[PDB]
Amino acid sequence: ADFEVHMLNKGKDGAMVFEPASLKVAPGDTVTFIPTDKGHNVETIKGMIPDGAEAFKSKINENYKVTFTAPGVYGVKCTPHPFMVGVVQVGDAPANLEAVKGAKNPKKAQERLDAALAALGN
Numbered sequence: 001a002d003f004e005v006h007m008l009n010k011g012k013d014g015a016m017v018f019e020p021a022s023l024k025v026a027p028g029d030t031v032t033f034i035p036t037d038k039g040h041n042v043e044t045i046k047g048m049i050p051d052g053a054e055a056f057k058s059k060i061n062e063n064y065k066v067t068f069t070a071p072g073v074y075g076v077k078c079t080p081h082p083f084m085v086g087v088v089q090v091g092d093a094p095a096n097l098e099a100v101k102g103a104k105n106p107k108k109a110q111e112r113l114d115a116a117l118a119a120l121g122n
């Protein structure tokens with residue numbers, strides 16, 4: 001299955017958001033990150049992807065497709081915007097939940113990550 005995540009200056013969750021900010025996918029599914037407004041990108045957060053997964057980074061304004069196979073949670077961020085974060089989860093019972101959940105980001109970033117994890121049923 002293929003999914004889309006858009007990058008926005010403003011959403012229900014406030015300034016600088018991924019929409020949706022959480023997505024549960026099956027191994028082999030893809031997500032394309034599509035900027036709706038200028039000035040955004042996507043990249044993995046340091047230490048927040050599974051064993052077996054590779055880090056990634058897009059250019060500002062670039063449509064960027066990633067295939068997710070390794071099970072677990074994947075924290076993503078936007079380089080220029082500090083609060084702009086999201087989580088992609090592959091499978092059930094992710095093994096690296098604590099890497100995201102137990103992290104120490106600014107309050108707004110951490111609350112968005114934590115809400116994403118809860119939305120995903122963790």
Ligand SMILES: [Cl-]
Nearest residue numbers: 061062063064
């Ligand atoms: Cl592009």
Ligand SMILES: [Cu+2]
Nearest residue numbers: 040078081084
């Ligand atoms: Cu952004």
